């Protein structure tokens, strides 16, 4: 899946944990966010075409990724705990991250 | 270590863990296919010793084995609360991600 | 914000936990932890910086802060936990990794 698909499985699953009722489906939105993220690493985004596959903007865009690898990391340990409610408020928190990651390479 | 002794370092303690008697034994296994897996994500995997350690193909190979780390972290967070048969039921999603790295790699 | 400002980063939290008593100071010192080590991550350490982006030495120092990362989350599990003093334990030896990452690329 190219980045700009990867993007919108992870503002989709940020929908459904903002609208989810039990620790079931935070957990599979959080584990298809975190099968985006690893993806989207692979991906290059197209204002990025021309450049080295590991030039430092590419590394500044797959550690971009890491970042939000590691706050997916948190939801989903708060998740697998029952703590719906915290896991929620820190998917705010991935949002925010997302958008800014989609802001700076689109 | 080389590809190939990770490889076999994993392979190994998958074994461990499908007969693991407890937490510990099972936490003591993931934390050392943890390691082994960062220090394959250094190595060259014999399909791509005709490739640049930058082209795609070899980030495509590392982020493969970031894919694997996270699997790895899901199972040993279900050993840290002391849930040995779900870890080894996770353990067994490892195998297929394993085996399926080394088809593709060897 | 180089490299370098990271480092020094690590080693203040560091201290910060080393001086802790209750579990939500040392969880506020290693995510500040895991937040400089991914910013460090994709950076370019002095050492390095005549070799190609494109270079191995490059990949396992990106490497290197991925080990660092998982210690640091192996830490901030035992104090999600509850157990200070084996977070405390664990970060002595986080002291190692990052002094020991910091004094190879300086
Ligand atoms: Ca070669
Ligand atoms: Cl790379
Ligand atoms: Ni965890």
Same mark, same amino acid.
């Given at each position: 899946?190219?980045?700009?698909?990867?993007?919108?499985?992870?503002?989709?699953?940020?929908?459904?944990?903002?609208?989810?009722?039990?620790?079931? /489906?935070?957990? !599979? $939105? %959080?584990?298809?966010?975190?099968?985006?993220?690893?993806?989207?690493?692979? *991906?290059?985004?197209?204002? +990025?075409?021309?450049?080295?596959?590991?030039?430092?903007?590419?590394?500044?865009?797959?550690?971009?990724?890491?970042?939000?690898?590691? /706050?997916?990391? !948190? $939801? %989903?340990?708060?998740?697998?705990?029952?703590?719906?409610?915290?896991?929620? *408020?820190?998917?705010?928190? +991935?949002?925010?991250?997302?958008?800014?990651?989609?802001?700076?390479?689109?």
């Amino acid at each position: 899946a190219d980045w700009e698909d990867n993007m919108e499985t992870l503002n989709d699953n940020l929908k459904v944990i903002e609208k989810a009722d039990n620790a079931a /489906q935070v957990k !599979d $939105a %959080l584990t298809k966010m975190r099968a985006a993220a690893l993806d989207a690493k692979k *991906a290059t985004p197209p204002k +990025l075409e021309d450049k080295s596959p590991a030039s430092p903007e590419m590394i500044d865009f797959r550690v971009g990724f890491d970042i939000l690898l590691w /706050q997916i990391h !948190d $939801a %989903l340990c708060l998740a697998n705990e029952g703590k719906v409610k915290e896991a929620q *408020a820190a998917a705010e928190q +991935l949002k925010t991250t997302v958008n800014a990651h989609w802001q700076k390479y689109r």
